[PDB]
Amino acid sequence: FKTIDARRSQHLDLGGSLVGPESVAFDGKGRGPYSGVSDGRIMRWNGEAAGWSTYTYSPSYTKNKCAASTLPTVQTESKCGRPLGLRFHYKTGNLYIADAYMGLMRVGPKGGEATVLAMKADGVPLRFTNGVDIDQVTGDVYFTDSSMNYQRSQHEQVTATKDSTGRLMKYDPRTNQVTVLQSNITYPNGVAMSADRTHLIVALTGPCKLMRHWIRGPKTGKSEPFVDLPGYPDNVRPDGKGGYWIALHREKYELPFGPDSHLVAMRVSAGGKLVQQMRGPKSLRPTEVMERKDGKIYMGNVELPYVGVVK
Known part of the structure; x- marks a missing residue:
């Protein structure tokens, strides 16, 4: 496993002044990247010719x-929403959205306006709904609230102040219930x-760590250290080979490796080895x-006006 070169990369340009396709989710039919962008929309990529189509959005976006x-999106975010985490339930074709302001939402295979499933957990409202993944077998949804x-808008202040008010939660699609698995x-x-x-x-962004929370067996509810990273981790996604790709938006240590050779991601094994x-x-x-499958690696961000593609 030789170091992947991300210097040359294809840019899938978003229209208008849209930026920050934070997630790069693929549906059950393998359709091009679905991405939550700066203005609150979840856009779908349909190739070079067709480009980005609007797929889903919060009820607040319409209302x-x-x-x-x-007005600039940084100001109208809390009104219009800011979609971050994306994951498709293959069996139904449903898309689960982790929207920073609008909480956990879901939309059908046809798309259109999304439906808010949870804006609160144990009475406390969700203020920074960030990460999401799905148990593809049961349909259970695991998502995070960062603070x-x-x-x-002030995601850097979570790191700067060493804020420790984040929550890891389960949403059960059968009982329509939200449990807090881990808090603080x-x-x-x-x-x-x-x-x-x-x-x-x-991923613990500020701490520069991955942690393991068990959901099955005798250790259910136990959180433990997994691995320390030399960067600030964002999203965790399977690499399709039993491990994970970890996005690293910043380095922890600026190692002098010459120009345009900054650590921007790490592949981690099931056992938590680099x-x-x-x-x-x-x-x-x-x-x-x-x-x-085709060797291509799609890459999200919160600042650039495109999805990056390497390999």
Whole structure:
């Protein structure tokens, strides 16, 4: 597993002044990246020719006439929503959205306006709904809230202040219920279920760590250290080979490796060992890394006006 070069990469441009396709989710039919962008919409990629089509959005997006808003998105975020985490339930074709302001939402295979499933957990409202993954067998949804204090706009303040008010939660699609599995977490972000489905791997952005929370067997409810990372992790996604790709939006240590050779992602094994690194420009600031069958690796962010593609 040689270091992947992210210097040369194809840009799937978003229209208008849209930026920050934080997640790069693929549906059960393998259709091109679905991405939650700066203005509150979840856009779908349909190739070079057709480009990005609107797929889904929060009820607040419609209600507040956000489509015809003139003001910069950083200001109209809490009104229009900011979709971060994306994952498809293959059996139904449903898309689960982790929206920073609008909480956990879901939409059908046809798309259109989404439905808010949860905006609160144990009476406390969700202020920074970030990471999501699905148990593909049961349809259970595991998602994170990064802070009770700071909204997405001040995500850097979660790190700066060492804020530890984050929550890891389960949404049960049968009982329509939201349980808090773990609270007082230091900036929980990305979440991925393990291949063997016994635990979750959760990214702690500020701490620069992955942790393991068990969801099955005698250790159910136990959170433990998994591995320390030399970068600030965002989203955790399976690499399609039993491990995970971890997006690293910043390095913890600026190692002098010459120009445009910054650590922007790490492939981690099921056992929590460092397998492979991806180095590229500092501007990439990746939030999600999605390897595919055809060797291509799709990359999300919160700042750039495109999805990046390497290999």
